[PDB]
Amino acid sequence: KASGTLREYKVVGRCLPTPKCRTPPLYRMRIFAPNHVVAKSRFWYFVSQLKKMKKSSGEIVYCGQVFEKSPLRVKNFGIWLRYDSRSGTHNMYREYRDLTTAGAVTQCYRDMGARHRARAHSIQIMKVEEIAASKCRRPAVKQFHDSKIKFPLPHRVLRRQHKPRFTTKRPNTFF
Amino acid sequence: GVDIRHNKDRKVRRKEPKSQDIYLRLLVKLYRFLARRTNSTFNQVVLKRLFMSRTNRPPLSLSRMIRKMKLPGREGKTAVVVGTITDDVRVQEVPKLKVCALRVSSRARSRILKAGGKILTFDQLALDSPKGCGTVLLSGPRKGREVYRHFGKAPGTPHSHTKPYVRSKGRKFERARGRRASRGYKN
């Protein structure tokens, strides 16, 4: 499984009706995937892992993207992860600060890849929950909980280095 | 980058006769024009048979032609043979016929003309019936040659009746171990 700018999808599906079971129950899942095809594939994977249901033996009643209810609001998202390392699998709980649930999930994927070299196919996401200022255990996200936030940009390393390459003036890093 | 097997892309069917004689080539031109113009398939079949080699157009016997013309329905029809018509000595009553062939033996020609029949060449047949109407197409026995007796399942094999290549048939040239039950085995 690859990853990009992930989006959240609500997928409801059920096994195809049978003469013994005329009205099978429906199951709903939240899958974070780049597109609906991979979202449905991951939904079928998780459904096969959990219940006795297969893609050929079932059907997805409805797959639809879920939009963030408060895009302009900054939120703390706690994500429960179950990934596979070189050794045995482990369970983790991480906290991120972002405006969207899909963005938080993407940031979690990038952080997992950067810190543990864990691939998206080995990463399984269980639950993502929005939490208030309290109930936060990670100091990296706790330090930003401050009303009178104040910090400068000390070492402003300049960009546009290949804009005119030879110049008389040396650049400046204090602003 | 396409997977096409060129093993049998070239068809091996003949296009022109290998013979360098001029009369056959003129007949080939005539029947090429007739086949490519007329809608009748008789001209196409005649052209294909003209293209065939000597062994592929065996001579037709007078008795075989007589028995094929005696069939009910083909009364007063011209017989078309691309090979040669050969006289048969074991037939006495020869009714008059209308025979079209490349060649006719002298004896068969005399028999047909004495019986009151008519012999036509291929150009005359084209002039008479360009599309081959009222024609009975006949040919000699293709497997009549003794060559085909040596073909098929090889000898020394069960349920095989193929004539082997022997320098001279005799008592002490074959019918020994491999053919006699008293000597080894037989097939």
């Binding site: 690859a2 597109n35 997805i60 | 980058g1 396409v2």
Partner: protein, 168 residues
Amino acid sequence: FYVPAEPKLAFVIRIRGINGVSPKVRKVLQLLRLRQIFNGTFVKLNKASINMLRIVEPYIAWGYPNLKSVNELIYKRGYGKINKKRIALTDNALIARSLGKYGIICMEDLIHEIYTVGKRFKEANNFLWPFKLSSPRGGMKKKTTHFVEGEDAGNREDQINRLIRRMN
């Protein structure tokens, strides 16, 4: 909820070459009239067709074509098989002569029969020469992996329209 019907036809494009191909995969590819790389063909969907596409899944990318995709494929790169010869559909006379017995007399009838799978979809598709599509402009994600795992092979039902736009 309203579950949409499974599509009656699908568009399949071979994405890899002819070097190092399993015998069964090659047989299915040549049965689907997919011999050269970047060749497309409309295949109606059923149990047998889906099983064959599953067999040759790593070697093909297939999806559910759109009406505009069908129109562009038939118009820009539409060739008919007449007398075993690939002849462009420059006029409706060729289609009328070939498929007149089936109520198909023009490009519009051909497109309708291709899109809304009818009784003579087999005859229309067999008359249609396989579409020799060009290389995908803008590149590919990955030829050797499945579409779900970031590659281009496999089922890409809706994105096959984007692929057709980039190739046709």
